[PDB]
Amino acid sequence: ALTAEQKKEILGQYGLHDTDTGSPEAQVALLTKRIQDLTEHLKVHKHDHHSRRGLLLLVGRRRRLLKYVAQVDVARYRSLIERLGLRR
Amino acid sequence: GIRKYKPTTPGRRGASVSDFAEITRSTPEKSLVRPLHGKGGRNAHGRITTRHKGGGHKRAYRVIDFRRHDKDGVNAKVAHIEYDPNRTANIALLHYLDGEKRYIIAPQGLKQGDVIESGANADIKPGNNLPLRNIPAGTVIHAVELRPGGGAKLARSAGVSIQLLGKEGTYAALRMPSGEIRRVDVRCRATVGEVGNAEQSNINWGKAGRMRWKGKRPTVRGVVMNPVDHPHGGGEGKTSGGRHPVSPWGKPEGRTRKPNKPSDKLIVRRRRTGK
Amino acid sequence: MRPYEIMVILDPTLDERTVAPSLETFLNVIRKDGGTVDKVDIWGRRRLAYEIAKHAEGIYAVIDVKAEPATVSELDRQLNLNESVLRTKVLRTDKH
Amino acid sequence: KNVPHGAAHIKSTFNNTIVSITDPQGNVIAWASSGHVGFKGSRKSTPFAAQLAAENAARKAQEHGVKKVDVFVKGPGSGRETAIRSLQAAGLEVGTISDVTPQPHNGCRPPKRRR
Amino acid sequence: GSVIKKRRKRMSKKKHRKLLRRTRVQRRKLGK
Amino acid sequence: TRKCVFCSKKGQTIDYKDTALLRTYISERGKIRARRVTGNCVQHQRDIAVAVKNAREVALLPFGS
RNA sequence: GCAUUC
RNA sequence: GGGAGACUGGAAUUCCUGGUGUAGCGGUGGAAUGCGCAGAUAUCAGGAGGAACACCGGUGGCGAAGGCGGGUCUCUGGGCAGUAACUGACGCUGAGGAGCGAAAGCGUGGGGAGCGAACAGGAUUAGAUACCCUGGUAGUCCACGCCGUAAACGGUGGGUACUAGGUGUGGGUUUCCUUCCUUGGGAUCCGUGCCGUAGCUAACGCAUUAAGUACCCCGCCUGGGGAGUACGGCCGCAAGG
Ligand SMILES: [Mg+2]
Ligand SMILES: [Mg+2]
Ligand SMILES: [Mg+2]
Ligand SMILES: [Mg+2]
Ligand SMILES: [Mg+2]
Ligand SMILES: [Mg+2]
Ligand SMILES: [Mg+2]
Ligand SMILES: [Mg+2]
Ligand SMILES: [Mg+2]
Ligand SMILES: [Mg+2]
Ligand SMILES: [Mg+2]
Ligand SMILES: [Mg+2]
Ligand SMILES: [Mg+2]
Ligand SMILES: [Mg+2]
Ligand SMILES: [Mg+2]
Ligand SMILES: [Mg+2]
Ligand SMILES: [Mg+2]
Ligand SMILES: [Mg+2]
Ligand SMILES: [Mg+2]
Ligand SMILES: [Mg+2]
Ligand SMILES: [Mg+2]
Ligand SMILES: [Mg+2]
Ligand SMILES: [Mg+2]
Ligand SMILES: [Mg+2]
Ligand SMILES: [Mg+2]
Ligand SMILES: [Mg+2]
Ligand SMILES: [Mg+2]
Ligand SMILES: [Mg+2]
Ligand SMILES: [Mg+2]
Ligand SMILES: [Mg+2]
Ligand SMILES: [Mg+2]
Ligand SMILES: [Mg+2]
Ligand SMILES: [Zn+2]
């Protein structure tokens, strides 16, 4: 899980305004962190299938949020992809 | 690990080779190398006394430290892990803070840059060598002396290890890789850990020629010789030998440990067969 | 840095006057590592509810430390390698 | 040999009863079993057969001078009370009755159910 | 429902498995 | 049925140190008493049971006296 | 304990 | 007791070593094979080793399902309530597809105490390829793969709204009665049980955790056998799916 500190840092960079925690950009950035860290975990624990199911749920959520951003404003979509290092 | 070959040829199908992953340097220490030459299984009389030997790749001897007794307190760092032709285990080059360089059997998990120490005060960490007296019971050890000062003799092959079962008086009880339980003097030295390269046993050599590279000559079965050559020899067509199995010199298949050896007093029980 | 409470049972053949020094050295690992060693309560010789390593009694010590997980696991490993330590028990003393 | 005070170990199972009299140090001084009192087969699991076995061991213990005994009973048989009574009647004092049937804390798999 | 229904299927399956046992090597040699 | 003494405002903390507290909740056979007998709530019964098990391992309590 | 069939 | 890794605890079974000590032990409905008399069983002490975790422990908790219970530590997934700070329909379902998926089984390497297909004897019987007894190998355990089935069941697909109540129990909030004792009582949110209306059902029964009243999407059925078989194909080391 992300601590308050790590969350504040991520939100300060990707939130569209101060106090913003709900925008897709903020959420996708929080999801990306969580996913990275959980990927690191699953490199060590290959057989932790239950936590990997949690990973797949986070992946699915991020995909849908990104699909929303592309539907609303493709420019914010491309900015978000490149700024996070995502492929798609 | 093990790397499996692709079946591009009949000779390579099924064969595998070590991945040599732990190996850090490809060349030995010049100052620790001595010459070696093939014997072909022949003794001082020039007679073959061990059959099926000869024709293998030329190899050089790396001087291995099996005593590790004149460096108590002088720490060393693992400089390299490298391949040794003369044994199944890999070897680790140690740089002592003395500036002395020595080779030791590489224990399991020992990586480049690790710090190794010797003597009574040493930590119980893989590669550390200390008297059994100072090694707590239950630990896994290798390269154990039989007599104090005699040099490591037991548990030296890749992947093997000895379990120190307990201490009573002057003796420690050890379980050998074979499973036999035997007593040794607590003054005898041992190295903490298992021996590395434990995957080597899984290698499929694949073809006759690769054993020839390793110096093994073909083994002819007794039953296909003539009576003059072997007790199993003779008979029209295929036979099972025509008598109870014996060596080429007629000895039957039985126990061959000499009765009433002095070491019988140190052996608690022999290995179990067919467990 | 997490709070940890460590219970140690030491050889009854030891003397209690020398117990406290020997634990303090064993605890330096933490102080060199950046954590704190607060309280080293040493209970006296008590009767064990059952024999441990042929001992009917032993010396109980409770050590409260704040340190990194890695450093406390290093401490425990050294403790269990020491001949005079019979049994250790580390408990994380904070929510979850 | 002589020993004033001892222990009686009584193992009563669904097939037999085995009483052994011992020093406090655990060395057996006398023993008797339902087969030793001449019962064979299923007859040796009855409480009457436990009575005779306890009596016979008690007599053999009096020979070695045992006066008072603490009894340790185990097993699920029907010759436990009978055996305590027969020890008393054969002239032994019974101090403590303690039950020490070995109970696993979830250990070895029991043999399969009979049907 | 009635176990009768299960019993009918049971028999057919069992006989098929037994047939597969008896023909195992034949099916390999004829499938090559 | 009876109330859970640990839910009260006076309720003592449950620690594997406290041999005398834990003695209340083990039988003379040394066995952990059923919650239906003790009146503890589910959460505090778990605490007691775990505390007892830890106490046994550090030999502050017996394995079946 | 054992007790198939019409 | 959601998952994963590491270390570790005690009881018990078995074996080993050594006391004490004999002639029985073991097993059944009743016996016999069996183990003993070359020193068993029993009892005491020490040692080895593997597997499962008594009490707590429940028609209780957690998990999508399969499932999950000795302790500790490390890493990690989900859920619920309160507050409305934030985004502003971003929702639901999902043909194909992908992943997970009890037990048995399969591959390679370890381990193997107990249990135990096959396999031996003994007994029972007309026979006894069984039930019962004595033994006993794969396997059961671990590491990494494969397999992809179960009455994998609530024999009840997922989402949402509505439609008398009563009464247990698990996890939160809150108001009153006040000792402020607190299983005091109320309200409220989220689980999990039992009983019961209306309504539904061939009946049995279900009944706010629907099998009721409705809307959205998927899967599936179309008399019993032949047959979840043949052929073809795909997947699998094989079994086979
Ligand atoms: Mg010469
Ligand atoms: Mg040869
Ligand atoms: Mg080599
Ligand atoms: Mg080979
Ligand atoms: Mg040959
Ligand atoms: Mg010839
Ligand atoms: Mg000849
Ligand atoms: Mg011929
Ligand atoms: Mg061999
Ligand atoms: Mg708690
Ligand atoms: Mg007929
Ligand atoms: Mg594992
Ligand atoms: Mg004996
Ligand atoms: Mg015995
Ligand atoms: Mg879907
Ligand atoms: Mg589908
Ligand atoms: Mg399995
Ligand atoms: Mg097979
Ligand atoms: Mg297998
Ligand atoms: Mg195997
Ligand atoms: Mg059987
Ligand atoms: Mg799979
Ligand atoms: Mg199916
Ligand atoms: Mg199920
Ligand atoms: Mg179904
Ligand atoms: Mg529905
Ligand atoms: Mg409810
Ligand atoms: Mg109802
Ligand atoms: Mg219906
Ligand atoms: Mg059909
Ligand atoms: Mg088919
Ligand atoms: Mg086909
Ligand atoms: Zn409570």
Domain ranges of chain B: 1-114, 118-195, 196-275
Question: Are B163 and B138 spatial neighbours (Cβ–Cβ below 8 Å)?
Answer: yes
| C-alpha–C-alpha distance, residues D87 and D103, integer Å | 26
Alpha helices in chain D (DSSP H): 47-63, 81-89
Tokens of B255: 């126990």
Q: Do C11 and C58 form a contact (C-beta atoms < 8 A)?
A: yes
CB B32 within 8 A of CB B48: no
Instruction: Measure the CA–CA gap between A7 and B77, rounded to whole angstroms.
Output: 42
* AA identity, residue D55: E
CB-CB neighbours of B226 under 10 Å: 9
Instruction: Specify whether the CB–CB gap between C81 and C75 falls below 8 A.
Output: no
Total of domains in chain F = 1
**CA pair distance A26, A15, nearest whole angstrom:** 5
- Inspect the interface and report whether the beta carbons of F59 and C9 lie closer than 8 Å: yes
Q: For position F57, which CATH number holds?
A: 4.10.640.10
C-chain residues near B136 (CB < 8 A): 81, 83
Which residues of chain F neighbour C52 with C-beta distances below 8 Å? 59
Query: Any idea which nucleotide's C1' is nearest the CA of E11?
Result: H227
Q: Count the domains in chain C.
A: 1
- Closest to F60 in 3D by CA, of C52, C11, C75, D106: C52
Residue E20 and residue E13: Cα distance in Å, rounded?
Answer: 11
CB contact under 8 Å between B124 and C83, yes or no, is no
3-state secondary structure of A32: helix
- β-strand D93-99 against D68-74: which pairing, if any? parallel
Query: Residue F1 falls within a domain, yes or no?
Result: no
Q: How far is the CA of A11 from the C1' of H175 (A)?
A: 39
Q: Determine the Cα–Cα distance for residues D36 and D15; give it in Å rounded to an integer.
A: 14
Burial level of D42, CB count in 10 A (0-12/13-18/19+)?
exposed
Q: What is the resolution of this structure in A?
A: 2.0
Method of determination? cryo-EM
What is the rounded CA–CA span in Å between residue B236 and residue B240? 11
Please tell me which of the candidates C52, C62, C91 has its beta carbon nearest to residue F59.
C52
**What are the backbone angles phi and psi of residue C75, rounded to the nearest 5°?**
-60, -50
- Residue B190, sorted as left (phi over 0), alpha (psi -120 to 50) or beta, turns out to be beta
**Helices D81-89 and D47-63 sit at what angle, rounded to 10 degrees?**
40
> In this structure, what are the phi and psi dihedrals at residue D35, rounded to the nearest 5 degrees?
-75, -30
The torsion angles phi and psi of B51, rounded to 5 degrees, stand at -75, 165
Ligand 20 centroid – CA B275 distance (Å): 14
Domain ranges of chain D: 2-115
B136 to chain C, any CB pair closer than 8 A? The answer is yes
Burial B238-275 (b: 16+ CB within 10 A, else e): eeebeeeeeeeeeeeeeeeeeeeeeeeeeeeeeeeeee
Q: Is F63 on the interface with C (CB under 8 A)?
A: yes
Q: Which residues contact D86 (CB under 8 A, 6 or more apart)?
A: D50, D51, D52, D54, D55, D58
Alpha carbon distance B132, B185 (integer Å): 8
H or E element, residue C44:
strand C36-52
Task: Take residue B46 and report the two structure tokens written for it.
Answer: 């020039």
Compute the CA torsion angle F8, F10, F16, F21 (nearest 10 deg).
-100
CA distance between the termini of chain D: 50
Q: Give the Cα separation of C58 and C51 in Å (integer).
A: 10
> What whole-number distance in Å separates Cα of residue A83 and Cα of residue A26?
12
C66 close to C39: Cβ distance less than 8 angstroms: no
A50 touches strand H (CB under 7 A): yes
Please say whether the beta carbons of A38 and A61 come within 8 A.
no
- Asked whether B3 and B203 are in contact (CB, 8 A), the reply is no
Contact exists between E and D (3 or more beta carbon pairs < 8 Å): no
Specify the pairing of strand B33-34 against strand B16-18: unpaired
- How far apart are the C-alpha atoms of D6 and D21, rounded to whole Å? 7
Residue with tokens 């190398």: B33
The topology under which CATH files domain A1-88 is: Helix Hairpins (1.10.287)
Contact B130, B117 (CB under 8 A): no
Give me the half-sphere count of Cα atoms (radius 13 Å) on the Cβ side of residue C38. Answer: 9
**Chain B positions in Cβ-Cβ contact with residue C81 (cut-off 8 Å):** 123-124, 136
Where does B1-114 sit in CATH, by number? 2.40.50.140
Which residues form the domain of C64?
1-96
Q: Quick one: CA dihedral B125, B126, B128, B130, positive or negative? A: positive
| Three-state SS annotation for chain B | CEEECCCCCCCCCCCEEECCCCCCCCCCCHHHEECCCCCCCECCCCCECCCCECCCCCCCEECECCCCCCCCCCCEEEEEEECCCCCCCCEEEEEECCCCEEEEECECCCCCCCEECECCCCCCCCCCEEEHHHCCCCCEEECEECCCCCCEEECCCCCCCEEEEEEECCEEEEECCCCCEEEEECCCEEEECCECCHHHHHCCCCCHHHHHHCCECCCCCHHHCCCCCCCCCCCCCCCCCCCCCECCCCCECCCCCCCCCHHHHCEEECCCCCC
Q: Which residues contact D10 (CB under 8 A, 6 or more apart)?
A: D17, D18, D19, D54, D71, D72, D73, D74, D79, D80, D83, D84
From residue B243, give the alpha-carbon distance in Å to each of B219, B227, B239, B248.
21, 12, 10, 13
Angle between helices C69-81 and C16-33 (to 10 degrees): 150
Q: Which nucleotides of H are covered by protein (CB under 7 A)?
A: 1-5, 8-13, 16, 19-21, 23-32, 41-58, 60, 63-66, 69-78, 85-91, 99-101, 108-110, 112-116, 131-133, 144-145, 151, 155, 169-172, 180-183, 225-229, 239-240
Spatial separation of the C-alpha atoms in residues B196 and B88, rounded to whole Å: 9
Q: What is the distance in angstroms measured between the alpha-carbon CA of F40 and the sugar C1' of H71? A: 22
CA-to-CA distance for B55 and B60, rounded, in angstroms? 15
Q: For residue B208, what are the contacts with CB-CB under 8 A and spacing of at least 6?
A: B218
DSSP C45: E
CA A60 to C1' H98, whole Å? 13
CA proximity to D105, closest of B46, C4, F56, B82? F56
- Torsion of the alpha carbons at C37, C39, C44 and C50, rounded to the nearest 10: -70
Residue F30 one-letter amino acid:
G
Residues 6+ away with beta carbon under 8 Å from D30:
D20, D21, D57, D60, D61, D63, D64
Rounded Cα distance between B216 and B41, Å, is 10
Residues 6+ apart with CB under 8 A from F8: none
Kindly give, in sequence order, each residue whose CB lies less than 8 Å from that of residue E7, ignoring residues fewer than 6 positions away: none
Helix (H, G, I), strand (E, B) or coil at A73: coil
Report how far residue D63's alpha carbon sits from residue D51's, in angstroms, rounded to the nearest whole number.
19
Phi-psi region of F12 (alpha: psi -120 to 50; beta: other; left: phi over 0): beta
Stated as kind and residue range, the H or E segment containing C4 is: strand C2-10
Structure tokens at B63: 């001087």
Fold annotation for D2-115: Nucleotidyltransferase; domain 5 (3.30.420)
Cα B187 off chain centre by: 23
Q: Which domain holds residue F64?
A: 11-65
CA distance B186 to F61: 37
| E8 alpha carbon, closest ligand | 30
Amino acid at D30: A
The CA distance from D70 to D96, in Å, is 5
Q: Sign of the C-alpha dihedral, residues B19, B25, B30, B33? A: negative
Ligand 18 centroid from CA E26, angstroms: 19
What superfamily does domain B196-275 belong to in CATH? Ribosomal protein L2, domain 3 (4.10.950.10)
What amino acid occupies position A41?
H
Chain D residues 29 to 88 whose Cβ lies within 7 Å of strand H are 29-31, 33-36, 40-45, 72, 74
